[PDB]
Design an enzyme around this catalytic site. Structure first.
Site, PDB file in Angstrom:
ATOM      1  N   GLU A  11       1.068  -1.239  -0.019  1.00  0.00           N
ATOM      2  CA  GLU A  11       0.175   0.043   0.302  1.00  0.00           C
ATOM      3  C   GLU A  11       0.907   1.310  -0.037  1.00  0.00           C
ATOM      4  OE1 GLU A  11      -3.088   0.130  -0.800  1.00  0.00           O
ATOM      5  OE2 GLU A  11      -3.959  -1.654   0.477  1.00  0.00           O
ATOM      6  N   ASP A  20      -4.114   7.346  -5.294  1.00  0.00           N
ATOM      7  CA  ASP A  20      -4.111   6.346  -5.729  1.00  0.00           C
ATOM      8  C   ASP A  20      -4.730   5.828  -6.507  1.00  0.00           C
ATOM      9  OD1 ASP A  20      -7.126   6.014  -6.104  1.00  0.00           O
ATOM     10  OD2 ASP A  20      -7.412   3.671  -5.010  1.00  0.00           O
ATOM     11  N   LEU A  32      -8.610   5.374   1.545  1.00  0.00           N
ATOM     12  CA  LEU A  32      -9.088   6.731   1.493  1.00  0.00           C
ATOM     13  C   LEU A  32      -9.533   7.580   1.776  1.00  0.00           C
ATOM     14  CD1 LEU A  32     -12.564   6.646  -0.618  1.00  0.00           C
ATOM     15  CD2 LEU A  32     -10.532   7.332  -1.030  1.00  0.00           C
ATOM     16  N   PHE A 104      -8.426  -6.642   2.863  1.00  0.00           N
ATOM     17  CA  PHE A 104      -7.934  -5.083   2.326  1.00  0.00           C
ATOM     18  C   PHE A 104      -8.194  -3.850   2.190  1.00  0.00           C
ATOM     19  CE2 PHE A 104      -5.467  -1.192   3.252  1.00  0.00           C
ATOM     20  CZ  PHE A 104      -5.032  -0.669   5.100  1.00  0.00           C
ATOM     21  N   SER A 117     -11.842 -20.143  -4.804  1.00  0.00           N
ATOM     22  CA  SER A 117     -10.173 -20.397  -4.232  1.00  0.00           C
ATOM     23  C   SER A 117     -10.628 -20.437  -3.177  1.00  0.00           C
ATOM     24  CB  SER A 117      -9.773 -18.965  -4.642  1.00  0.00           C
ATOM     25  OG  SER A 117      -9.779 -18.638  -5.518  1.00  0.00           O
ATOM     26  N   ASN A 132      -6.286 -20.458  -9.778  1.00  0.00           N
ATOM     27  CA  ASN A 132      -8.602 -20.345  -9.787  1.00  0.00           C
ATOM     28  C   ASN A 132      -7.994 -18.410  -9.422  1.00  0.00           C
ATOM     29  OD1 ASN A 132      -9.484 -22.648  -8.297  1.00  0.00           O
ATOM     30  ND2 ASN A 132      -7.606 -22.616  -9.367  1.00  0.00           N
TER      31      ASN A 132
END
Length: 162
Positions: A11, A20, A32, A104, A117, A132
């Site tokens: 991040e 971003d 955000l 996250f 998955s 996958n």
């Protein structure tokens, strides 16, 4: 390694407001502020989120606290999800990290959509889940970021985090 360190990697950290990936005003570790195209709108959320006039500028301690509160969300979201809990509960220290990493970045719902998955993860079907997860839009999205994740679900170690 710590989740804090993996998220700085993926991040990044930033003490002053910035657009971003999609161009959204962000700050700290993957934070955000708004989708809206008003730097002015960003600063006001910053401030509310801080409880002070930052004029976009925060202080580590600020940053830090933010994130932790961010991690908190994700983790609970995981804890409340029928699809995720069992998967989470099943993983080893490391793969659980990837998981929260995932949530996250994309949200609880966005992540639980991965029926297949998730199931393999549960069965410990490592190269299969990866196979996958690499069909997703999310892998197309952030391939650099999705690459490390998968790898690590692949490995069960932090190797790829360097």
């Amino acid at each position: 390694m710590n989740i804090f360190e993996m998220l700085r990697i993926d991040e990044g950290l930033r003490l002053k407001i910035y657009k971003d990936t999609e161009g959204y005003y962000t700050i700290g570790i993957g934070h955000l502020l708004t989708k809206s195209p008003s730097l002015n709108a960003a600063k006001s959320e910053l401030d509310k989120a801080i409880g002070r006039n930052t004029n976009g500028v925060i202080t580590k301690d600020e940053a830090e606290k933010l994130f932790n509160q961010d991690v908190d969300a994700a983790v609970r979201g995981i804890l409340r999800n029928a699809k995720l809990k069992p998967v989470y509960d099943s993983l080893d220290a490391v793969r659980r990290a990837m998981l929260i990493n995932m949530v996250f970045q994309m949200g609880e719902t966005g992540v639980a959509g991965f029926t297949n998955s998730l199931r393999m993860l549960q069965q410990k079907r490592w190269d299969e889940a990866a196979v996958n997860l690499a069909k997703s839009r999310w892998y197309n999205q952030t391939p650099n970021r999705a690459k490390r994740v998968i790898t690590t679900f692949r490995t069960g170690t932090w190797d790829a985090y360097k």
